[PDB]
Amino acid sequence: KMSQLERNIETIINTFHQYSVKLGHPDTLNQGEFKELVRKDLQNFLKKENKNEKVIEHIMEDLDTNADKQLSFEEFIMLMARLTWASHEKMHEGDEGPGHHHKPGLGE
Template sequence: MTESSRLPHCSPMKQSSCKRAEYPSQGRPINAGPAPRSPTLCVALGLECRKMAELSQMERDIETIINVFHQYSVRLGHPDTLNRKEFKQLVQKELANFLKSKKKDEKAINHIMEDLDTNEDKQLSFEEFIILVARLTHASHEKMHEHDQGHGHCHGPGLGESGHGHSHGGHGHSHGGHGHSH
């Protein structure tokens, strides 16, 4: 059996739901409906499209990140980059809890954008934007560890209560009992 024949595929009827919707690039209000669909992970990787129901939780989450980026990137200018205004709107609306102290601070938002804009074109490509997502994910993971010290939190042999795996007491974060060290 070949690699592609083992993967579940969308039916021709479902294929249209896997394509990114086209939206006008000017004047799209913040709450103008759902984010445009991006190509699915499978299409982006050169595979045939799979049904959303067959995607894993992480695959759905990755698609959500892509869709949110595109929801803001199509508003002004180039449809696949965020300009300063689009980035500010995204930060204020989508990252309000992660960047509480910075979301109203214009200088802080500008500094974050300048830091991410590695090619200095005053826009953020998806590749530049995803650096922020990675940094926030890492910081969130570290914060989770800070707050869970001694509350059902285990880091493997000698570091936690059970010595098996890595759990966050109801946060749904585990590594299959193989331990996790920092």
């Protein structure tokens, strides 16, 4: 079984984990690993942000709630929620109606 939503969440978890498990604490990302995840797995959603390393660094500093220079999964999932939000907003940018329709989302 496993629902669409559960599969989706597993993807998020497994994508994080593949980077986090490599070095140091196995369930946190360091700055280079975060930059790598963003460069590879968010190459479309964060295309323009990827062009500026300082922007990406500021994004990480923002998510790093406990300020220990690492990203936990709890800190990271806020980024996922923000991009999901931004993609849906893009789907409705300049929406005039009537009824419900989605334009292309982020990275499209």
